[model samples]
Target: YNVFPRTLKWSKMNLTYRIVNYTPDMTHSEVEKAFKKAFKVWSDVTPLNFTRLHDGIADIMISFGIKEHGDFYPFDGPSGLLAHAFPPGPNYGGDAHFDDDETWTSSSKGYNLFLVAAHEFGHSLGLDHSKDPGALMFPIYTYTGKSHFMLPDDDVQGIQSLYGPGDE
Candidate 1:
């Protein structure tokens, strides 16, 4: 199990996100739908709240980019690097960027947008990838099926340990 550093955790429960751009692979609604559901994964297990912003700065700024796309963390194209996310913080922090070079989709075929986004959101929330096989925070890509998604106990405990219980 990888421990989430408390120092990097967001102090506030309410967080905002903005979709800076869309990947050509999927439609606008498809990309948006994956993110919405992805953000929900963490919110469901913590007091944290995620809201989408049409403009202005947001806690999490998501996008799809190729190599050397602005940030110091340049993404590798295609197979190797699917996406990367930053820990909670100010600028560049809490942001998630996907590699447009890879095949991104809303379904199980190719890279499942919801699954990868959910895993990336885990990192954005200050969770490091886990060695536990079925954990959501596992670094490797594994499709957990297209049916209803649920976090394993490891993931639930991981987020809860950082942000406490979900809001009723």
Candidate 2:
């Protein structure tokens, strides 16, 4: 099972997210809503609960930008790397960044923020990509088995691994 470190208990832990710059292609609310939808896609299936905050101090801060945005790994100018995030931790540790240079959209022409955000969030929650393509934790962003979203089994197992299996 891909569980969170035992050192961090579920009750005491929280997943918070905040958005930085908004894409002109998508409204701030659209970006926020899409992210929220991505977030619910995971939390709805997990035993673990998440609390969102209005302030910028959330566990995960999603953004877009150019090279060396004050991080060790600089952005690779558009295509080479679509997005990346850190494992769970305080402040900037759990943040994620998408290469704004790439077209971010719901359709295939662009990189879907929802799909990428979900994958990055998994990383922020301490999940490594799964070898199984069926798993949402899979690193690549491809159409997930003819479905537009995550598989139920992948959802349940991913959450169970983080929080434990049982009714919330």
Candidate 3:
């Protein structure tokens, strides 16, 4: 059986991202740091590289909101659906949205932004949910702890299929 399936992937190795806004749950620096770490999760394992932009359009646009955030799939408030992202392409593609109703945190007490962002960015990189429970692309959210976080083999294989083996 296939360990993981591919749908769409970015045509380029280098990509730019922009954080449209910040959630009040954490400091701006904290949010930035969390996202940077999250992006690195994939960048570290694949040929992909992410660059953050302060202004102008970027390949990936990240933001936080409550409900009806100008997308077909609106936020479902707190815990039902924490966030979502589009596949790689143009316009709405590669954008990530976080439900502001959830208590986003840097630690295990609440939903961790870095963990969730990593999952969402997986979608941005053309990865779908993995059947493997240990996968970072698993649909369900699990706080594996920031210091303890490691990309599961299923995800590493899937991403490598799309982007090739990274500088490991």
Best by TM-score: 3
TM-score of each: 0.93, 0.81, 0.94
The Cα local distance difference test for each model comes to 0.90, 0.70, 0.91
Q: Which ten residues in a row have the lowest lDDT in candidate 1?
A: 142-151
Ranking by TM-score: 3, 1, 2
Error of 1 at 128 (Å): 0.4
In model 1, the clashing pairs are: none
Q: What lDDT does model 3 reach? A: 0.91
List model 3 lDDT by residue over 1-168, tens digit each: 768754488889999999999999999999999999999999998888999999989999999998888987888877899999999988888999999999999999789999999999999998998999889898988787888988889999998989998896
Who wins the lDDT comparison? 3
Model 1 over residues 1-168: C-alpha lDDT tens digits? Answer: 699754569989999999999998899998999999998888998998999999989999998999999887888878998999999888888999999988999887889989999999999999997989989998888886646688888999999989899966
Residue 65 of model 1, lDDT score: 92
Candidate 1 vs 2: which has more lDDT = 1
Question: lDDT by residue for model 2 over 1-168, one digit each (tens)?
Answer: 797654232243446677877766677776787688777766766654556566667767888877777787887876878888887666667788888777787656677778778788777776776877777777667754225564457656766687665455
Point out where model 2 deviates above 4 Å. 1-13, 144-147, 166-168
